[PDB]
């Protein structure tokens, strides 16, 4: 599994969703 946090990732084409981004924390 991972140890990231979910963000409302958005695109220019396609749309937005829940992405585990993983910020260096």
From Swiss-Prot:
GO terms for cellular component: extracellular region
Disulfide bonds listed in the record: 4-20, 10-16
Coiled-coil region list: none
Locations listed in the record: Secreted
Keyword Ribonucleoprotein found: no
GO biological process, one term: killing of cells of another organism
Assigned keywords, A-Z: Antibiotic, Antimicrobial, Disulfide bond, Fungicide, Secreted
Record function comment: Active against both bacteria (Gram-positive and Gram-negative) and filamentous fungi. Acts on the membrane of the bacterial cells. It destabilize a membrane by modifying its properties.
Name of the protein this chain belongs to: Androctonin
Organism: Androctonus australis
């Amino acid at each position: 599994r991972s140890v990231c946090r979910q963000i409302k990732i958005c695109r220019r084409r396609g749309g937005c969703y829940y992405k585990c981004t993983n910020r260096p924390y």
